[PDB]
Amino acid sequence: LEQSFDNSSLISSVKELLLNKDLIHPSILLLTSHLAHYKIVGSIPRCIAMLEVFQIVIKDYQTPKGTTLSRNLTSYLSHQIDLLKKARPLSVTMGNAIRWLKQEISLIDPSTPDKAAKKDLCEKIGQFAKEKIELADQLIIDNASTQIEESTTIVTYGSSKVLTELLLHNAISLKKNIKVIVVDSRPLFEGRKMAETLRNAGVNVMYALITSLDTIFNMDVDYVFLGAHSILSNGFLYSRAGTAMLAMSAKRRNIPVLVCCESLKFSQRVQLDSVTFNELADPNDLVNKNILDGWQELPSLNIVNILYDLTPPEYIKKVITEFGALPPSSVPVILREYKGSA
Amino acid sequence: EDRLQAVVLTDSYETRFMPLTAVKPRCLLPLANVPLIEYTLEFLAKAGVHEVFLICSSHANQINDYIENSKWNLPWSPFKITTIMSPEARCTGDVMRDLDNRGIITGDFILVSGDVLTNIDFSKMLEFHKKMHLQDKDHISTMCLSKASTYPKTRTIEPAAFVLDKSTSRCIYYQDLPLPSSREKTSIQIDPELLDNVDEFVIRNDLIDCRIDICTSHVPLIFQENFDYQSLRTDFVKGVISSDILGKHIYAYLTDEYAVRVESWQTYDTISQDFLGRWCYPLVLDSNIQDDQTYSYESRHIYKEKDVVLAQSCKIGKCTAIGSGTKIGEGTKIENSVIGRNCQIGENIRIKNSFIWDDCIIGNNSIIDHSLIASNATLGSNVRLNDGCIIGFNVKIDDNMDLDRNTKIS
Amino acid sequence: TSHCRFYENKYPEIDDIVMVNVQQIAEMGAYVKLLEYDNIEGMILLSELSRRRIRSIQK
Amino acid sequence: SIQAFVFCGALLPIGNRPMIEYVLDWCDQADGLTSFLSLRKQQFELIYKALSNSNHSHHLQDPKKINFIPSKANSTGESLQKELLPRINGDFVILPCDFVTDIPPQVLVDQFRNRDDNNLAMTIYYKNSLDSSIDKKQQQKQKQQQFFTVYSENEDSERQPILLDVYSQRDVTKTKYLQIRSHLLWNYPNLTVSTKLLNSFIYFCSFELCQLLKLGPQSMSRQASFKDPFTGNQGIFILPNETLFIRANNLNAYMDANRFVLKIKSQT
Structure with missing residues (x-):
């Protein structure tokens, strides 16, 4: 309260x-x-x-x-x-x-x-x-495939939306060497859906968890890719939660951050604080006699979870869309010139 | 309750490892740089036993030289260790009638056959055994088995049908089952006459054997008279539940995590990668237990001891392990492959998925895939190995020679 | 051997109507190959394709 | 969409309600319970339907086509298949003749709703209930039914259990003595059977009437051998389902229905 x-x-x-x-x-x-x-x-x-x-x-x-x-x-x-x-x-x-x-x-x-x-x-x-x-x-594939050299690593997050095909394309259809690191979070273990598909296709997947996020970045690592749920009018990203911690860690350890997005996904609205416009998601999922039962009937206890939070636009090096690459501070020009008009 | 006895019965799988295993036993082979007796021994010392009985059917002198030079013939070991010398190649079972003729064993004891590697807390297996004692006075034993539910068809030699109870997990019946290479043999039979008062049972294939059976001292006396048995489970646990002796029921336990046993190289590779990866917590490699090694742990699953000379411009991939005093060279590549102590790796070799043991001078430009090299077997320049080679102890190889799949050279 | 001419003149002489397919469009317009003289190819200008400026997502 | 069907199998109503009225206006209480049409033969309809067509305030929409052949004169399968190509509108549901339930079929039709796993037919069942003691009757007719009891550990499939085979007393346990195939043991590697399972005959259905026109699966009679052909290779073809629960429901097949309505089913 x-x-x-x-x-x-x-x-x-x-x-x-x-x-x-x-x-x-x-x-x-x-x-x-x-x-x-x-x-x-x-x-x-x-x-x-x-x-x-x-x-x-x-x-x-x-x-x-x-x-x-x-x-x-x-x-x-x-x-x-x-x-x-x-x-x-x-x-x-x-x-x-x-x-x-x-x-x-x-x-x-x-x-x-x-x-x-x-x-x-x-x-x-x-x-x-x-x-x-x-x-x-x-x-998106044909634009982002030229910005990956051979024998490098990629740190995605969660379930990707478009760049699963990007990793499959640069793994198999272009045959250049690549070592994808997939990291996801409690409770929607949706990075495993990428891990099954990518390793079934035969690329060097190395799954992790976001609690151990430090020891990923202490290896040979670059090119963090990020799937987007929306990109706001300012430049603030908006995606599955836990994105922004590896975003700020990735910008902190001076390795680039990209966002594969498309022009259907840019939004007209605006926010800058993370817990302003957001989704609460079913707090019974954060339990699995269990570990605790009944956050209700116990006074003074609560269980919260967040699906969506914002990376600030200082962190994203490059939003890529199907028209081309762009800095994230320049997203209103594609809000006004290309979205809807195309 | 206490004063746990035990018996390990190795040396029954020499058919499996035949290019090796004729100069030192199966139980004395280094799984991860150290010969795997202690992978059983540290486990059942954490189980808290007081005596073991090593059956050494072959190479009995080079068992006891290691045993007397172990850490187990020193006066603070949690069990005293005793051996049993043997005429060659006895079938199992009759070792227990020889034991009953000698008459040492009183109380509960471990029938650990083969060589196991596990993480299971045996302490919580005691209360299953004692609940079997309290709720049944017609018990035989408990059989702990793993739940490898995500893979059938790949536990190589024997697939089995551990059909057992819903509620009490009493082992109902047992039957050997054929291989995925054979499309021909397609039937098993469970005759329902002994299925009268069960009313609820489960039949599974996803339980891998590990031969860790703990029982009472009544059942070797039971086993004394019925002198027809030569295996431990193809004949006995069938021939003790199939209405043969009345009022003698056998039970079987299922764990939830990793507990495995050596069968062959198509299991040796898998358990080496599970142990060398972090799939075997807490019985892991970097703790430096066995012969006081100095393994450190980077990320990407790297194991290195002290005094390792990693040369410049080399790359070492996932899930490797390197002993002390070695020397790799320029342009080499290491990936998913354990390397023994004090070897001499040459130039530009791409070692991959191959278990190179101690003191192996590998020549230059001689790439290796799955070709696990036993001790002292050197190589030469441009010796292109390939898959399946299990090149044995102390094998000199000259230059430019190629090998084939499963070329079991010695 | 594989395919050849229509009517013994090397090119489609001025102001006739032929059919093509567009191969790729980067900045010149398309590198249209002529479907009547199959192995040959010509090109075409960007402002000539319609009057509308062609989006890449339309391209 | 959904289409209902009723087959043909004391016989008097005991608990002051006809047995057909139970299923017809208790399968439609909540409002996926609304069917498109139900089907029934005649079978002395003036005794049952003339009382079951009471209280016309729910506006019961009943086109009920009456056939003659699927009324015990023929086996249900081969007589049924030739009366489904004129009887196609979507998804099919069959019902037995003298069924009774306690929980309404809303969870049954919802378990038939949420079926994104491209499966064929769920068969919601229930075992024998909690009786008193050792029976004062003859030998125990326990029909050994062969299936997959509990949910498997593996996610992404078989969240409802998949039925595997069928054998029975009096023809298999005295002749073949409960043999189980190995090919059906490898795929679905955890077979779990029990003997108390009462075949509830509910047997939902789908467009396998559009699938089955290849030769071979037309030989089934009395609705048993549709996964008894494993139909693999010697990967795996089409697959049916199963579902069951714990307690708090009742039905009847044999002549214990008198004691059921006496001391188990009291209408109070």
Whole structure:
């Protein structure tokens, strides 16, 4: 109660909406129970999953009697959004996809016989997942592969989103020597998902933990890469928690820090303090007769966890996006010149 | 309760290590730079035993010279150590009838067969044994076994079916099982007549044998009359549970962590990398216990003693170990490979995954993959080794010679 | 041997209509190879491809 | 979506409610319990349905197609497969004839919801319940059922247990004497069977009606041999499931249903 941060209402832990007011798609109930119960995702996996379940929910139209397709679908899809809003708070890859999707719903005209609706929403959202995600990531690979010399190391963090393919490309498709160090954190052990895939493909993975973060950097080490959840308007990064400690340790021990991001993921909002806009994530996960049971019913005890916190832009040497490399203080120029306009 | 007795029965696996093992026993081979008797001995001294009985079926003099020059024939060792001389190549089992004819053993004791390497607190195995005593007066033994659930099919020689109880973990039945190279032999049989009053049982393959059996002194007297048994588990634990003697049940324990036993080189490599990595805490290598070494520990799993001469422009990768007094040279490469004491490594060699033992003068430019070199076997210039070679003790090799896969040269 | 001419003139003489594919675009425009004289190649200007400035994500 | 089905197997209602009314309007109490359509034969429908079609305030939407052949005149499998290509709308669910439960099927249909592990068919079961003592009856008919009991240690798959084989009393334990294959022992390396398991016959379903049209799996009768073909190589093909729990539920198959409704199932 001294800082009162545990009563931050940016997430609501209410569950079990039983209301049959709308036709909630059973696939989207599978998607929400797949997100919120056992988190299998990053950010662009959530974006591709949300996008290819909205694919199915527009393919299964079921239009009402007197309402045109241009006058129902945004409210229907917003009530589809509300279940994910209950499940897990949204990324910017959530938001900059759904507002684009609503803008593309808006420019349809009341003459579609609900047969070309597929041909201008399914194909167009496939062009979205092609353009603003996948070939953009292909440009990320082809832009960041020239900035890695042979026989070096890489320190990623958590589950990567795009640069798993970068490490696989520079490991196998370009055959230059590389020694990836993957480090992750309690409780979402999502660096192991990178470690299984990278070592299954046959690259020198050396897993670690973030508590032992000192002895990684005392080896021969350079080129810390970082997956991003969003990049703010100032230059502050925003990603899975525990990123910023190895960011400040990496800048402290004068070895460079990079962020592989794409122009879909830049955000309009602004913050500079870490615990301001943030997600509380289910404090029963930090236990696994257990070690302790019942932080409740014991007065004066609490268990907190944080998913998201900010590296200051002094630490990131280079944000790379599909247009090119850039200093992190110069992200509003791609907020204004390229995001949305491309 | 106390006054724990014990018996180690080595020298039954000389079929396995045949290019080696004919000049010094299996039990006297250096797993990590030191001959692996003490990998059993420090364990069962931490178990707190008071006497052991080394069965030495072969090379009995070069057992006892090491034993008298050990730290165990000095008057503060937690057990006194005794040996048993032997005519050559006895099958197991009949050593226990010879023991019963001699009549030394009274009380609970360890039937440690083979040569093990483990981290399990044997103290918490005592209360399982005593709970077996209190809740059953028809007990035989307990059989601790590991839970290697992430890998079947790769515990090489014998795969087994340790079918046992749900609740009490009483070993129901046992059966030998064929190999992944054989697609032919596809059946096992468990006849349900003895399966009457069990009502809950589990059949697993992911339990690796480690031959650490602790029992009561009744069961060698049980084993005395039934003189048909020649193995320890292919015949006995089948032939003691298969309705043969009534009112004699055998139990088996499952641990949760690392406890393993030597089978062959496709297990010797794996246990060498598990021990040399930090997969064997706390029984680890850098503690400098056995023959008062001076191993230090960098990151990336590097083990070096004192007086190591690492030459300039060499690189030493993951999971290696180098003894004292050695000398490597310019352009060499070391990776995932233990190197014995006092050797002389030459120039530009890429040693990888090969277990080079003591006093091995390796010539220049002679790269090595998995070719573990026993003691005093020198090499020469441009001697390209390859996979599977288990080149033996004191083997002179001339220059420019190539080897093949599993060329067991001696 | 592999492929050859259409109509015995070495190049597509001035102001005819042929078909190409774009090979790569860096700063000159595309290095379009002519699909009628397959092994040959020409090029094309950036401002000539549409009127719109081509994004790299569009490129 | 979901499609229901009911097969054909004292016979009077004991606890002042017909047994078919139990399953039909207790499978629909919470609101994934809403099915698209349920199916049933006639089977003296004027005794059961004319009382089970009471209290029309829930607006029960029932297209119930009546067949004649799957009513014990033929085995369920080969008579059933020729009545599924006109009976396809999505995912299938079967039910037995005189089923009874205590916990509603909401957790059952939710365990059929959260199935991202591309599996085929869960079979939620339950063993025999907590009876009194040694029975004052004849020999114990313990049908030896063969399966994978507890959840495995390995994550990312088989969070519900995978069914492996089926054998039984009176034909296998007196002839083949509980043999277990080695290929089915290596893959899924921790087989765990028990004998108290009552086959609850619930047997959810999926688009394996769209899968199975290759030759060989049409030989199954009475719904047993669908993973008894291991269908590997001598990697692994399609795979069904299983689920069970601890206590607090009841059903009936044999003639102990009288003592069940007498002293185990009291409607109070």
